[PDB]
Swiss-Prot record:
Site (Interaction with target DNA): 73
Protein name, entry field: Endonuclease V
GO biological process, one term: DNA repair
Catalytic activity: Endonucleolytic cleavage at apurinic or apyrimidinic sites to products with a 5'-phosphate
Database matches in Gene3D superfamilies: archaeoglobus fulgidus dsm 4304 superfamily
PANTHER family the UniProt entry points to: ENDONUCLEASE V
Chief localisation class: cytoplasm
Positions in coiled-coil regions: none
Keywords assigned by UniProt, alphabetized: Cytoplasm, DNA damage, DNA repair, Endonuclease, Hydrolase, Magnesium, Metal-binding, Nuclease
Requisite cofactors: Mg(2+)
Cellular location(s): Cytoplasm
Amino acid sequence: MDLASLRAQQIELASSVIREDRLDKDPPDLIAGADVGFEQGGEVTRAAMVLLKYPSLELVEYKVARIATTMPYIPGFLSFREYPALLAAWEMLSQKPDLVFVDGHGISHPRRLGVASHFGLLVDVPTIGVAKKRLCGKFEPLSSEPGALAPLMDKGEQLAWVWRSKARCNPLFIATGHRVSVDSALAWVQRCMKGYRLPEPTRWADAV
C-alpha cells in the first residue's frame, strides 16, 4: 500500500505543522508569493514563485518551474502532486525569503495539510495559506464592507480567518501554513495589501 503509507505520511506532516509564530527574521527583509496549478489536463505541474522586498512590497524576482506530474490525482492528496513543483520553483530563487505566502490552503484543509502547510513544513520557512475559496469548516456569513472578519470553525477549532480584503470582492481564507499563528497570518496578509483583492505576493505569483 503506497496508499496507506501516503496517508501515514500525511497525518505525520499535519502533526508536525508549527502553529505558533517562529519567524527567524521579524520583520522580514524579503517575502515570497507562490502559486501552483496544472497544465495538459494534469500531466504538467506548474509553480510560480515571486520575491518581494518588505516593507516596500517591490517585485525583485520571479521564477516559473514546469515539471511532469508523477502521481495521479487521488482525492485528499492534492498537496503531494503540488509540492514538487513548488520545490522546483523555490530552488530557482536566487535568495531565500523570510516569510512565504502561498495561494492555497494552510491547515484549513480536510486533512489539516493544505499545500501551504505541506510546502512550508518541508522547506521549513514561515508560511501562510492565503486561499481564495473555502475548502472545509464553517463561518458566519460576512457583511459586505471591506474589513468584515469572521473565524473559520471546524470541530470546535479555528482553522482560519475569513477576511474581506476589498469591497465587492469575495473574502480570503488566511490560515497558518507553518511557523505562523492564525492571528499573525491575518496580520501579515493585511501588511502586504496594496489596493487589490489579494496581498501583493500572491497577486504577483498569479500574474506571472
